[PDB]
Design a protein around this ligand. Sequence first.
Ligand SMILES: *[C@@H]1O[C@H](CO)[C@@H](O[C@@H]2O[C@H](CO)[C@@H](O[C@@H]3O[C@H](CO[C@H]4O[C@H](CO[C@H]5O[C@H](CO)[C@@H](O)[C@H](O)[C@@H]5O[C@H]5O[C@H](CO)[C@@H](O)[C@H](O)[C@@H]5O)[C@@H](O)[C@H](O[C@H]5O[C@H](CO)[C@@H](O)[C@H](O)[C@@H]5O)[C@@H]4O)[C@@H](O)[C@H](O[C@H]4O[C@H](CO)[C@@H](O)[C@H](O)[C@@H]4O[C@@H]4O[C@H](CO)[C@@H](O)[C@H](O)[C@@H]4O[C@@H]4O[C@H](CO)[C@@H](O)[C@H](O)[C@@H]4O)[C@@H]3O)[C@H](O)[C@H]2NC(C)=O)[C@H](O)[C@H]1NC(C)=O
Ligand SMILES: CCCCCCCCCC
Lengths: 123, 123, 338, 338, 334, 333, 333
Amino acid sequence: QVQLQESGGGLVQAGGSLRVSCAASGRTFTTYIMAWFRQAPGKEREFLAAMDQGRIQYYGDSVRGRFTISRDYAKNSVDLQLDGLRPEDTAVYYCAAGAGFWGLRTASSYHYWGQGTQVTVSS
Amino acid sequence: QVQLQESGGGLVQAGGSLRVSCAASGRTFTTYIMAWFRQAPGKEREFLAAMDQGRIQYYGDSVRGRFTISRDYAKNSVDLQLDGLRPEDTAVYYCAAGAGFWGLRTASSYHYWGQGTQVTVSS
Amino acid sequence: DNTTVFTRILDRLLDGYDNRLRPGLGERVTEVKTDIFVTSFGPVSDHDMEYTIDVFFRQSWKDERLKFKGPMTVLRLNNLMASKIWTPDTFFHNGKKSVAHNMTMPNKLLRITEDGTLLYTMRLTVRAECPMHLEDFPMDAHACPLKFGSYAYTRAEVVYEWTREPARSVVVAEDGSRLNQYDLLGQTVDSGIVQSSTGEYVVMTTHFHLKRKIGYFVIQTYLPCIMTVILSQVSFWLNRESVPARTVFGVTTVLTMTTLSISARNSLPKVAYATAMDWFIAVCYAFVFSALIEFATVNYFTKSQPARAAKIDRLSRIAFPLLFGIFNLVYWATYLNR
Amino acid sequence: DNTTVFTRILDRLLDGYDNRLRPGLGERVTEVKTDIFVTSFGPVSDHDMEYTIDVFFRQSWKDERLKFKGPMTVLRLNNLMASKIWTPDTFFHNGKKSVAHNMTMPNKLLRITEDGTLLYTMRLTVRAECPMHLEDFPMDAHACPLKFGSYAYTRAEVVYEWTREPARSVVVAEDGSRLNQYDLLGQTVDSGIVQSSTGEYVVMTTHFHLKRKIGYFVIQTYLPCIMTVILSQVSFWLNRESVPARTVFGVTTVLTMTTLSISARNSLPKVAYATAMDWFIAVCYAFVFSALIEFATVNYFTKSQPARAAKIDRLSRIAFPLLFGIFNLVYWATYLNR
Amino acid sequence: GDVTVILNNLLEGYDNKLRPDIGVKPTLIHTDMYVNSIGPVNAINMEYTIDIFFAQTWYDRRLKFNSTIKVLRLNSNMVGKIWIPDTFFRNSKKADAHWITTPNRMLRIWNDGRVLYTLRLTIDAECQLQLHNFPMDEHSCPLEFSSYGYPREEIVYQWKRSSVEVGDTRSWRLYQFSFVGLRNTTEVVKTTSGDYVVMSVYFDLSRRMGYFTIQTYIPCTLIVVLSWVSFWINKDAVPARTSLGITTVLTMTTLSTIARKSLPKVSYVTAMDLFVSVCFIFVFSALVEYGTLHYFVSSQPARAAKMDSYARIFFPTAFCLFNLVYWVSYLYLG
Amino acid sequence: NMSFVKETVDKLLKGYDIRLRPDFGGPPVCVGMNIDIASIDMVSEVNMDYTLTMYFQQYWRDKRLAYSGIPLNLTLDNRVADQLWVPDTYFLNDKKSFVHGVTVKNRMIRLHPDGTVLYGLRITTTAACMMDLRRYPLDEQNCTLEIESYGYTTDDIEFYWRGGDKAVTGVERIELPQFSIVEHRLVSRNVVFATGAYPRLSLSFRLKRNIGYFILQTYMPSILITILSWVSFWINYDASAARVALGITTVLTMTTINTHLRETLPKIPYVKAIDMYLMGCFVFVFLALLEYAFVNYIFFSQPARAAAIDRWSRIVFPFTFSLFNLVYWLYYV
Amino acid sequence: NMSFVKETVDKLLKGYDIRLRPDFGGPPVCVGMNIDIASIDMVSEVNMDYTLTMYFQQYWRDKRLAYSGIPLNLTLDNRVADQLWVPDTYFLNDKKSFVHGVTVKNRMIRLHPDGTVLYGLRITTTAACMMDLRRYPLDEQNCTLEIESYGYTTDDIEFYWRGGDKAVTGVERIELPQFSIVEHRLVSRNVVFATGAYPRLSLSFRLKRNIGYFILQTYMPSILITILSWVSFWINYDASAARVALGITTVLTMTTINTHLRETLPKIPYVKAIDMYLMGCFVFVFLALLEYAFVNYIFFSQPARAAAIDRWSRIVFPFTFSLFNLVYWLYYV
Ligand SMILES: *[C@@H]1O[C@H](CO)[C@@H](O[C@@H]2O[C@H](CO)[C@@H](O[C@@H]3O[C@H](CO[C@H]4O[C@H](CO[C@H]5O[C@H](CO)[C@@H](O)[C@H](O)[C@@H]5O[C@H]5O[C@H](CO)[C@@H](O)[C@H](O)[C@@H]5O)[C@@H](O)[C@H](O[C@H]5O[C@H](CO)[C@@H](O)[C@H](O)[C@@H]5O)[C@@H]4O)[C@@H](O)[C@H](O[C@H]4O[C@H](CO)[C@@H](O)[C@H](O)[C@@H]4O[C@@H]4O[C@H](CO)[C@@H](O)[C@H](O)[C@@H]4O[C@@H]4O[C@H](CO)[C@@H](O)[C@H](O)[C@@H]4O)[C@@H]3O)[C@H](O)[C@H]2NC(C)=O)[C@H](O)[C@H]1NC(C)=O
Ligand SMILES: CCCCCCCCCC
């Protein structure tokens, strides 16, 4: 059974480094594309970043240059460095994986999802 | 049945052009060699000209520069232009076809043969 | 002297020109506008996990060293001129052996406008890698990518952009499809960043979404398997005294399923997991093999318990067709949706 | 100072020399003497209708611009000098993809005598077209041609001749045969004229007369078919009460003939006529199929007309072996004489 | 501006026929390698395809320049102007650089003279495979490169701190193999014209058993089980128990040839052949069991009943015992 | 004399600008193309392409290459083509092509006194054409060859067929083993891309497949196996082993042939006309085997009606198969 | 220091004539050759050739390249070979070869103070050798490599093996899956053509084929099928369907084994040592089916003799077949 367990995250004050980590277990998702999504309460599910098997990094326009994504293919985990955090960044951060059919910026292209990690920014 | 029929020829006085034709039926001779042989009365059968699929024209020594051979591949026919005829050319002209095994200038290599056509030169 | 003016213009643009230096060196970042016109989306190879594509690859940038004044605002020059000036060193990150066509002349064009802008297109045949998960074969859909970027210049020196909106920058020709067993549902255009040991490089990406057509494998494998299972269930209607006849029914069908089982994997690369077609053959083999065992049980109980043998044969005429029909409904409903 | 003399001579020969103009341009006709040494006659391919050949292609002409007087009479020079002077543009009319070897160096020689004569040989591997009439397969013979001439100079500018008498101007090495299923009986050397859309050109032709060796197909096809026909006639000697046994004889032999019929044309090109082999498998098919209709006729008359059924089996033991023996006499005598 | 001036000064009087420090000391070259993908592994030809970014670093004091500019980042134009090491891959069969859309080469020159030269290569290397335990074999395919013409007194090679780098390990085209690990070594090889420094990268591979279970092991096992049905059929049905026996022997011959197409024509028995040969003995012995049974039917009908009963126990136990010995030997003993 | 010719050719190339087309910044240069087809071969349905060998001639006037005083058509060494301007003609549907280079590069340059340039090449190309195999093997294919200028638009270059309908020759001497060229056609038009409008010339052939090969290989074995299955009706209905073995072998053989043919064809997802016949023959041999199963199931209780079904099968099966062949061979021919 | 080396190398190439061999117009130049074999593979009977990778090296003295003052063996960049005279060595039986070119051209140039030049290349050549397959698969081939100068006769050039019989090394590290090298030999001779007499060096290998593969694939299946046919001699003659089915399958199986193997090799007219064995096993399995036919034809009228034939068949067939293998294996070994 695939489990995209997500660790890290939590409450932060006045921004700062809040590194959120996601670990894939039960299947080697190296060929697959591992992404990060953010869902503010009641707004929508928003794409943040994704790295494919060729170490190509994609970012959303609203978080470009602020959040950095990295993958540790040896340990089958993908991290996301959160820097310069803002109150608009307070949401539940999700971890996904899939083949990116019909686009890697669309949520429906990921067959596996994590349980979510809460990040709260106070300012 | 494969029948090489020959037309043209007849009586020509004191030299002059005289075209001899040959029409094929019952088999497509696009990939074969269509030649012309001349047989003087009782003497022997002599090679005159030939033409293969690549339009390469072969001629004998006795008729080089005088007789012109041409093939109409669409209508499956071969023609021979007899310019500058002489009393020495009064013989029977034959139409032949074959693969030219052991020499395209040998009468034994042509499996299909015509009936004949008399050419008479008067002077 | 009409073409002497243009000759003098060209000899002045190249007078002192240096093609080892990119435009705006130490002053700005060289921006390159890119777009692709797919003339033919070639065949997809499952054995090599790759696809072929023939494109017009157009690039454009600004080089102020090539500003000129003259009667014409554009100089549609020979592609021989393109080797005397600076051109981007674009390569395909997932590109295998590719071809730049040369018949009858180098398939390239170069055009210079009066403000120094350049247009530089070339005709290519790109073979690229497409990783494939064949766990749903022959009902699998893939997203084959096409990534390209600069090789020697980082993102602080050369950046790439699409000439138009990203959707309209990659255009596929209407009649160019060369796919035999795939459908091109659509393409997705994006742009990312790759981090290497030598720096950060902008990489432009484009994914083609392909779905496999199953018509070939229905005739090739599914129909022969379905008829083999049905053929093995005709044995139940033969009377129990035809022991030589019902043995030939069982043995021939079992060997026929063995022939199809091996033959079905010839198309696929030698993967080490069970595909969707493998599970269909395995269950079809189970129904064919179980039919032969059903006869051995009937034969064993004959001449000692004839009534029991008849009951087993009568029920088998219903259970075997019913369970195979039920299995086909579960199998096809499962794999057609996904 | 010994080597200095020859350096001065070559500088004087090439000073003011234009290699874009043939010798005697506008004054006479350039004559080229040609001869070939066939180092190996490669395999003949029937699927592609072609063959391979390796030659020492020699050419010789006269150039008054290269006359000299010095200590030597012949300058055996390097092959890079060949690109500094004018050389004929000889090509092969029916070539498909030839190779000029350049390992470890360009395999060419150039020798300049004091009177201007040049010798210019090179090593080539030519794949040439050979149309085949396969109506007598595998007892057929072919005359594969090899035609060459100038590509740009019409017969009013450049003409070709053989170095010696045409028979002795093409020499084949004794131990060069690379043929597997053929037999080079001999070659015929000729010369012709071709008219194109650009002018009249001289074509030098060589025809190699090959005869196929039937040894392979006697083992591969003719023996498995004869044994199958003989096998099906064993069924006439089994008693009429062995109905399952005599049916297996008929079915397997008919099935075997179908396998042999399909597999006989695997090597050949997809021609649209019947070869001499197809007329043997078809007749062998008729004998095998007839031997099963006879059994059905015998089995039909059993238990109702035993006298008539027994009579048919007696006659079939004589008629069937006799007719197949007569057919082989007629078949082999018809084709082995051609 | 003045970068053209700098480049003109660097190449003024520069001789690319001479290695740096041609009469002082060896040219120490540091090599990196980023493996893009290890392509298909061919057992028939005993080779494998690899695609890498190959990088070389060395010093050249003739290329020093003084300015505010630190590093000159050029392209493949200048590669043919300066001295380049003549590195080649010793075990390569067929290798080529990539040339679309331009030569895939990189050249960066620092102010102190350091030169970085990087190019992208696709190499089909030679890897001799020992197939005695096939399909349960492990291999260490090497990749050796040295200098063709410069002995150890002129060119010395050295791995950097973390030289061989991989990205997505599984994204490689390894279908039947799983990449285990990599080792990189450094030695000196003495040839007939000098001593050369050879750098090697070894890739350890383990074959995947999944394909062959679907392809060979399961079909062969089911054919053996097919012949055991003959023991529960009445002995009087002579045509029935022979067709069920003759076909399995002929079918087992068919599977034996198919399973050998993947391997090269070696002259030793692999683990696959040992399983197929044993499975052939079982189907062949079942038919001989019936022939012995059939010959004894009339003479000793009571005895013939016992011979068929034992085959229902001896044959199923013997084959289940062979699998226990076979699978333990090749998975826990080598 | 020969020193005067050398002086003339050097003067033509002195100051010549290879980077500029004739009449640069003026009226478009007209280029006339002739094609002399040498051979067509390797028409492959697997790769969906064909191979074409031809003599490709181009013909245009360049006033920079005009000379006077020499009443000759100067034929020059083919290496002089590297110093002149030639059109950037390419073939769009070309997958792989090369110019022959034995013994030298097969190329021709011939100048004329008024400045006209004749430029010929001997080209072997592998052009692409997608084939509709729905009526295979009784199908016609239209395979073309697109000729276009790459860098020059209609404002700079114009294409035409030199000689009209006679521009392309040598087609009637082509004898394909499996096809037969019915008609070739010459088309001239313009094509518009994002970079402008370019001239194009299209040469197309209409191939037609010869069926004589498939009669011996596919149709006859299927018909004979189907007829073989009808012998089962004349055999006694109480011979279980004989009629089941005859019925089973024909059914399994018919399945083998259908799969065996599809090796040398692409994995197209539709039903070729040859598949309809093999599926039609399979139904006949499958119903014959099912016919015996009904007889074997019923010949104990009702011996009389079992023999009647066998007697009718001797008429219905041969008659219905001949009706299927009548419909099949009339719809596809 | 490094400037002096540059000045010295520039001195040698000023006035150097690349078109003239060393001692042009005088005594012949001696060229010594070494070969270091890296691998031999792809020994193909289908194409009748083999592939060889080697470190080919050539050695000669040019008096124009002598230098003084530098006590070093100048190893120059391999691109300097384009400015020096090198022998025009070629391989006569070479079909397709290349010099490896990654990362640069695999080539070496090394000068010596007395003008001697060491020049090595890394070559991979597909060389042809015709095979006599009459004793296949127990044959012993002999594939050679011919070395010769294309343009220079014995008056100008002279080849020799540098080091005598130690000129070729690495022959003992070749890993051929199917063959095993027994011996290699070096030969020097002169070959006379129409153009003159040319030096030739010859390197040949004697390859012995390993028979272990063919035991598993052809000989063992053939023996087991033949033994399988003898089972019918222990089945009662009243089991007509059983004995005929056993006989028919083995006869057709032997045909299948024979035809498949001959399709892996070129269509050679003669009979190989493996065809003699399959034909021999075919006679044994064809006679067993023929032996039963006589029994089936005779057991109704006189069952006594029919049982006697089966008793003798249980001994004659196993005994004669063992006698057939004894004669066969002693003749071809
Ligand atoms: C037997 O005969 C065969 C032939 O029958 C022969 O093969 C030939 O071998 C020679 C070498 O011995 C080859 O020549 C060299 O090839 C180099 C590249 O080779 C690769 O690319 C080949 C294709 O080249 C095209 O594309 C590249 C870029 O992709 C381009 O650079 C080329 O010019 C060329 O572009 C033309 O064609 C394309 C279409 O393809 C058009 O789009 C384009 O517009 C243009 O028309 C490819 O074919 C090669 O593959 C073959 O060969 C390899 C082995 O080499 C083999 O493994 C393969 O299997 C395959 O067989 C290969 O991938 C090329 O770089 C060389 O040219 C350099 O150097 C020369 C010499 O100095 C110089 O004159 C050139 O101008 C050029 O300058 C270089 O460029 C460098 C680029 O990195 C650069 O670093 C240098 O600094 C320099 O740059 C310039 O220098 C000048 C001068 O200082 C300066 O003014 C400038 O500013 C700038 O700085 C050279 O051409 C030849 O290609 C082979 N032929 C064929 C058909 O493959 C074989 O060797 C013979 N054997 C023997 C024993 O004799
Ligand atoms: C040659 C193998 C014979 C196997 C069957 C033996 C039956 C009789 C046993 C006494």
